Structure formats: C-alpha cells, structure tokens
Design a protein around this ligand. Sequence first.
Ligand SMILES: *[C@@H]1O[C@H](CO)[C@@H](O[C@@H]2O[C@H](CO)[C@@H](O)[C@H](O)[C@H]2NC(C)=O)[C@H](O)[C@H]1NC(C)=O
Ligand SMILES: *[C@@H]1O[C@H](CO)[C@@H](O[C@@H]2O[C@H](CO)[C@@H](O)[C@H](O)[C@H]2NC(C)=O)[C@H](O)[C@H]1NC(C)=O
Lengths: 540, 540
Amino acid sequence: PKLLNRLNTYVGSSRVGKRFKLAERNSTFTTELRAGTATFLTMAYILAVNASILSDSGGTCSVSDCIPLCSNPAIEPSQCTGPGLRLIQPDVSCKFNPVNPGYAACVEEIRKDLIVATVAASLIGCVIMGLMANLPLALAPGMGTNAYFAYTVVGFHGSGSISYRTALAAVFIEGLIFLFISAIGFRAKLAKLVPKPVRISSSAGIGLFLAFIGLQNNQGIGLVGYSPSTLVTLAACPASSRISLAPVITSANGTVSLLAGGSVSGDIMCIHGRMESPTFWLGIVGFVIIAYCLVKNVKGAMIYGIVFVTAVSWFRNTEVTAFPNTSAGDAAHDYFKKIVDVHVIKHTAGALSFSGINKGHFWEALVTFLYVDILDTTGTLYSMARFAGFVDEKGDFAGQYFAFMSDASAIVIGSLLGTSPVYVFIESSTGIREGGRTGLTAITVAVYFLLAMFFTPLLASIPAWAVGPPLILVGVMMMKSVTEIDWEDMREAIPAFVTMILMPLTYSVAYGLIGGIGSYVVLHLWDWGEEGLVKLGFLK
Amino acid sequence: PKLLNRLNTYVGSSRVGKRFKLAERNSTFTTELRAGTATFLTMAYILAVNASILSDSGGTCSVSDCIPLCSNPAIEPSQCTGPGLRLIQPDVSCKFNPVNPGYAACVEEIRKDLIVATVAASLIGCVIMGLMANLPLALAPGMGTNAYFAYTVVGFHGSGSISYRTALAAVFIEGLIFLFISAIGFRAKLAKLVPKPVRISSSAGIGLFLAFIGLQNNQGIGLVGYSPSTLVTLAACPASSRISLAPVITSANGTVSLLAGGSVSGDIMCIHGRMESPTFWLGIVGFVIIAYCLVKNVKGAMIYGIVFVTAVSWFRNTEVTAFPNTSAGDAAHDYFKKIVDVHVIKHTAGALSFSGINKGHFWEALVTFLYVDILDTTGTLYSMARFAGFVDEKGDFAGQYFAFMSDASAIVIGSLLGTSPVYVFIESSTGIREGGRTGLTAITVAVYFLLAMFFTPLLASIPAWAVGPPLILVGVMMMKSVTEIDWEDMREAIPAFVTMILMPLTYSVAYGLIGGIGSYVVLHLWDWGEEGLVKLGFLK
Ligand SMILES: *[C@@H]1O[C@H](CO)[C@@H](O[C@@H]2O[C@H](CO)[C@@H](O)[C@H](O)[C@H]2NC(C)=O)[C@H](O)[C@H]1NC(C)=O
Ligand SMILES: *[C@@H]1O[C@H](CO)[C@@H](O[C@@H]2O[C@H](CO)[C@@H](O)[C@H](O)[C@H]2NC(C)=O)[C@H](O)[C@H]1NC(C)=O
C-alpha cells in the first residue's frame, strides 16, 4: 500500500509495539507521533514561562556573587583608586534594584541552567510516564506551583523567607512523600482531604495569581503599577518614566525620610506617559495573536504569540528590544547569536540543602506543595482518563498506580535538577484528542523536549513582555472552574471567594489556601457541632 | 376581630390605600411595613459603608483649608515665634500622609455632611419611587459606583484627575441623560449597547473591586499591604509597625533618594508583626458574624457585623478604639457622645461645578457612570419584576416607565446633595419576598432612613475595620454572576476575565470596562469582518 501504513504495521507487529500495546489500544505508530506533536505544541510555552519565572527567583545566586562597586558609576571597579574614591562591599541590597552587575550575570547563568533543568525534568518525567506507566501524559513543571515557588517561597531575587536550596529540599521531600503515599495507593484518598469549595476555587485563584504576575513589570507586560494611595493603578508607561520607592518616616511637619537599610523597590511607580510603553503594546499584540489562535482552535497559540513577540524583540536597536545597549544586553545578544548550544547545568543541579527544615516557612511551603500537587494531579489524571476512555465502572484507569509513582519520581528528579514540582498537564488532553493512547505519546513529547535543548540561546532571549500574555491567558483558561461553585450558598461562596481573591492579593497560593480552609472550617463549625450533638443525642 | 386586622381593612378601603392599589395587589398595610422593614434591614449597611467611602474622597475642600504648621511638632502654631522657627505654608501634600490637621477637620465635617446626604438622597429617592412609580423599590447610592466615584474619579483625598465638585457635575449631567433617554423610553434599548460578557462580568469585577477595598487599610481591615518586589503581600500588622513610601532615584552605586515633591504614601508597608493587628482580627470576627448571619438567612446580617465591630471600637482605651487619644480622636468622641443630632449640610449640598467639562477624564467618568448605571438598573428592575410577578408576556412591568424616570430623578437630586448616583438595590428584592407590592414599601424604607438621621454621631463613629468585612461580603454576593459566562468560549472568557480582573488591579471600574470592551471588539473583528464580506457577497 503506502510507506506510512507499512511503517505503522511493522511498528505495531514488532516487540516495541507489543510492549506499548499499540494493537490493544487501536492507536498506530504515526497516531502516537501526531498526538505527541500536538501535546508539545500546546505545552511548549513552558520552555519560556517556567524558565523565566524560576529565573526571577535568583536560583543559587547569593550576596557572594555580587561584586564590589566603585564609589561613582563613572569609574570601572579596577580603576577605583583615588582621593575620596572607594569600593563598596556588597550587601543584601545588591540583589535588588539597582541590581549588582555580578548578581545579574549570575542570574543569567542561572536562567540558562534553569532552562536546561526544566527541559530535562520534563523529558525525564515524560520518559518515565511513557515507559513505566504507559500513558499519553506529558510531564512538565507546573504553572501555579512554579509561580508560588519563585515569587512566594523564595521570592524575587531571593527576598522570601526560604532560600532556593531549602525550597528545592522542600520539593524533594514533597516528592518523597508522594512516592510513599502513592506506593501504598492513598493519593486518591488524600484527594478528598481538602474542602470542596477550596478544591475548585484554588484553580481560579492560581489563575488570577498567574494573570496578576503577567500584568506586572518583572515578568509581565506592565499595566499594573504602584499607587501611593490606592496601591495599584495603570502602569505601562515607558521604562524611562518609572521610579523606585524607599520606606520613609512621617512626622507632624514633614516627611523626614530614609529608614536606613530599607528595601528599595524596582521601577513600579509611573510618573507620566501612561499607556505609552511600546513593550506593553507589543505584549498586547502578542496577547491578541494568542487569543485569536485560541479562539480559532489553533494548536500552539501560546507558542505563536511568544515567538512573534520574541522575534520582534530580537532586533537590537528598538524600544522593544530584548538586548539593550548595555554590557548585560551585549552579553545576552552574544549568547543569542550562537543559535544552538549544549548547556551543562553547573549551579542548579544537586543544589539541595536541608538546613532550613526546622523553620516554619519551610513546612508551610512543603504543605502547600503537597496540597497543590494533590489537587492538580488527581484532577488532571481523572480528566485525562475520562478523555481517553480508560475509566471503567469502578472509576480507575488501570495504570493509575504507576502514573502516580511516575509523577512522584519525576517531582523528585526535578527537585534534584533544581526546578519546581512537575505535573501531568491538562494540555496532555490535546494528544488524547489526537488519538494518543499509549506511552509512546509521552516518548514523543520527550523527544521534542530533547530537541528543545540545543536551543537555550533562543529560549534565554525571551523578554518579560513575551512571557507576559501567556500568563494572562493561562489564567483565563484556569478561571473556568468557577462554574461549579455554588455561589448561592454562602458556606461555599465565601471560602471559594476568599481563596480566589487571597491568592492574587496576598500574592501567595499558601496564604490563599490557608485563608480558604480557615474560612471553610469556621463557617462549618456550627454545622459540625450540631451534627456532633445530634450523634451524641442532645438534639433531635 | 383583631386591632391589627382593623387597621389593615381601614387603610385598604381608604383613599391612600386605593391610590397605592393595596387591594389590587393583595398586599395589606402591615405587609408593606414588614416588607419595608426587611428591605431597610437588608440594605442598612450603606449608612456605614457609603458615607465612609465618599468621605475618603476628601469632599469639597482643598489645600485652602489645610492650616499652616509650625517647624517642629512640639510647638502649637500660634506660639511658633522664635529663632529658627517658622510656619510652613500648606501644599498639595497637606491632603495626604501626614494629613494636615486642618484638612483632617474637613473629612470629619464632610463625613457628617455625606451621612445626611446619603440618607437624604436615599430618602428622596425612595419617596419618589414610592409615590410617582408605586413600586416596592428602595433607592440608595450604589456600592460599586460609590467606590469608583471616591477612589478613582476623585481619588483618596482628592488625588484623582477630577475634583469632587466636577465629579458631582458629572453625576448631575449623567442624571440628566437618563431623564432624557427614559422620558423617551430607550433605557431598555441601551441595555443592549454593552457586550454580553462585559455586562455580566462587570458585576463580578466590581465585586472584586469592592472586596479589594475591604482588604486595604484606609477603608478595610488590612491584610493587603505594599511589597517592594511583589507590590502586594500580607498586611494586618499593628499600625505602629507600618511605614510610608517616597519615590527615590537609583544609580549604579547606591540609591540616592528623594525625588523632590514626590507623593508620600500612607502606612502601607509592614515591617514586622504580620497577622497581629487587633483591628484586623476584630474585622475578621465581624466577618464571621456577618457570614454566619448570611448563611443562616438572618436579615440585617451586615448591620450586626458592623454594629458589633463598631460597638467594640467605641471603647476609648483599647487597641481597636475608634477614638484614639488624639485631638481629632477626642473631637470624634465628643461628637459621638451626643447620641442624637440633626445635621445641616453646609459644604456638600449644591456643590456642583461645570468647570472641568472640557477635560477628557470628566467624560471618562461620566460615560463610566452611564454604563455602570445602565447595567445595574436594568438588571435589577427586571429581576425585581420577576420576583414580584409584575412581568407580563411582553416582558414589561407596567410602571417601568416611571421606575426608570424615578431612578433618573433621584440621581439628579443625589448629585445636588453631593453623593454618588443612586440606584434600586438588589436588596429591594428582600421586601418583595415578605409581600411588598406597592410603593408603600418604599415609603416605609424612606421613613426608616428619616430615623437614620438624628443618628449621625453614631454613624460617623464607624471605623475602617467595621466598614471592612461588609465590602468583602458584598463582593462575594456580586461574584455570583460568573456562572452565566461561557468560560469554554474564549471570545467570551477573555473579555469577561479582562473586565473582571482589571477593575481590582487597575483599581478602576472605567479601566476594567474599557479593557473588556476593547478586548471584546478586537476579538470579534474577524467575525464581524467575515460576516460583513458575506453580506457584501465576497464569501459564501
Ligand atoms: C553614587 O554616585 C552618585 C552620583 O550619581 C553620587 O550622588 C551623590 O548624591 C547627590 C546626588 O547626585 C549629589 O548631591 C552628590 O553630589 C553626589 N555625590 C558626588 C560626589 O557627586 C553618590 O556620591 C554616589 N554614592 C556613594 C555611596 O558614593
Ligand atoms: C520636622 O520635625 C523634625 C523632628 O521630628 C525636625 O527635626 C529634624 O529631625 C530629622 C531627623 O528626624 C533630623 O535629620 C533633622 O536634623 C532635624 N532638624 C533639626 C533642626 O534638628 C525637623 O527640623 C523638622 N523639619 C522641618 C522642615 O520643619
């Protein structure tokens, strides 16, 4: 007949085809390849978004990486010898605005390491899922968990309460816990520990958090900036018209300023020219492109928007350039010039540290990882199984046990490589829509991720306004869970609203979950006491 | 029979009963009184929330009422005569932190005016609806437009782009516009001008906006404070541990500070003691009290939470006191000590000013008032008519012509008295449930508002953490509109999400609507262009 059908029959009748059970699942070899291609197309925006978001965390960079700076900017530090001229030893302020050039270079190196680590963790998770579990599920570091890890647990440039190494240790312990509770088979049981309204509204809260991240300056398009009174107003004026903030002291006459050692912000307050920053408008154009491609059911909408914005930003001498005429910009362009590069992780791999176990914030972060990973994993696996028709009358899909162990092992490996916990994604459904039924789809996605290596220079040149609109639209897609919340019932509307609004407003998934669980418990205390008295018999 | 039944039969056969059509609507006199009481109880939280929010707008006064301050705080301004000692002329910074004692005298005096103006607008609006339209609809300044008028159009202490007097002129003209388009009868027709996702998600966006205000410091319980990096984190540390911010200049060596004339913020940045401010915990207790009463279907849930928090804050020497041991706090207690007082509006009444018509921000606010009021009034009235069974097969409720013209007339009067536009509340549905059918219910609510006067001292003593949880819980109830947004459709999910999220993030209803309408128009340009070519005939 045709060469394509000959290939399909040869693969299906071979040992590898029988091992993957292609015949018993009615999926051919090329069907699995097409499903993997579609899954990678709908998933590959991670290679930009997750790597950049983890890059904001600062990685393993510390104050030791900041170089001493001369008294005046006009003299290079080696020539900083003269009257009234001295070199300033770095402090904790070296990490934040104005960022020490040494710390910035360390952050770029960490960005390359984290691109490679994210790709490697996704590859290893996909391979484990395809081989050990034999399911068309593609694994990659999660969106909300990654954002929580970077901006809340470790914070921007390590401003959080837990260091990056200790957060990696938390992720590793979380993976070990999942391995333990999935070897027994209790993950389905712990999928009911959390309250229902919290369970549904956590996704919408995480989506709002991601959209708010995408509406900021350091990794979004702008449009949300500091306000002295209202605390948040319309940003997206040009970067030349943005100024920093430092804490001050007020008195009954005038504002005698400068609390010494105060943490100066970035460039968040807009002085004039609102709605005029070209980077924000380029982000809006990419947003429109992604939105149209999502409306038209075009696979890779996120990819097309990111690529368009990044390619416009790759030009050297524009206002939207990703390589400004600076030493750091010149280095970024020099690294981007070599299109293909094989990068070896040097700082992030094996960067675990169990020193901060005793701290309360460590356990808060670990419990948050447990809760969020449980919700995402149990929801997505059963949604996928319903998509693929693997759900029987009992409600299981045969390989669920190995699927959960694969996810836990992939989380452990990602922690060892130095990334946020890795999930099966909802976009895996795309492959299932394309006919993907066996683990060969995961193998194909892993091969695509492998080819996504040797392209670190193209992935490290993706600007913030390119990361940008993908976050907003990911939040839009996550928002759809609000439909099955009974907003008429206050016992369910109040905890759900509280969770959903605290995640973006406290800027913390942990704080949103804690607030929602506390509100649920408080609002149901009366009912639980009534039921306890009824069981005891004081009431009828 | 009974004296109660004798009263019902006497009025029903009287001229007043026949004019109100009690017999033809099967509602008795006491039924309207119970309905009016239930409507007032369900909506009485405006007497706390409304006046407080408009008070933050700064009212009518300006830097002219800030008093000159001595060089040092330790010397009273009259005794400010000595070597190196001088009186500081007030500037625009007198209005903001640290607030000039002269300007702080306004807000207390303006708050008393805005308590009466809120009641008088509510009283007159209820009477006109009760008499001219004969419907059980209670009119009061809207919750969402209140916050937009105070915090966005005029801004906190007049920091916005439009002065309070000009914003009143916007409301007056905006009131005239409906009076014109309701006399013709087109207000039903303009209910379709807005896109469907924008109309539905505007309520949820406003609810997020209102809950966002309830989580701030100047009008809420706290728990949301400034962050140097993330721009929002967990506030609600004690007020002694909050510090201000002033814009600064960064260089390549160090942050040489103080952009001269920069707008110093309030007390938004928390240094330590997070989750330890007693005022926030008092608000949470009030939040729990309202939530349980809302759950238990207890009428007046908002008031009980407001009253309990306000009553605890009335004690003089606690950490949650509403009258701190200051000169302003002593004056607040002195005015509170006289329980009953008849207040005459002296600054706010008739404070219109058409000087700023030519400015663009004036028309942005006026059109935003026009849009917001169209969605609120048309949606509420038909929901009320469905509740009261006044909707015929044609979909009208007979007295709709005067119902819209009554609402327009009340808005004009409210602007003259100096409040935000007044609407029929959704809480008007409450009295309809107990049997409110004629305009006598509105008269009864009007009488209660009359009794709400002579209690300005008790209403001007309501602290920010008492306003607080009602705003959060009003945001919860407004959030129920999300259920009829097709979140599967990106042509509706994206504009709805954008509309919903910009209102609390840009912290502006106008920006949320402009973004949502712009996103709706852009995302439908391809479809409209396709159908335009189909009508022309280039396509099939
Ligand atoms: C860092 O370099 C700046 C110059 O940009 C220095 O700024 C000083 O502070 C203000 C702002 O310019 C001026 O009034 C001073 O004259 C500046 N000093 C000098 C010598 O020009 C600042 O001195 C430098 N900071 C440190 C710690 O050396
Ligand atoms: C305003 O009040 C302060 C006291 O709170 C006055 O004293 C100044 O305080 C700052 C530090 O808080 C010192 O750096 C200044 O040297 C102090 N000034 C003097 C003369 O001692 C301050 O003088 C007052 N400022 C104005 C403009 O009146």
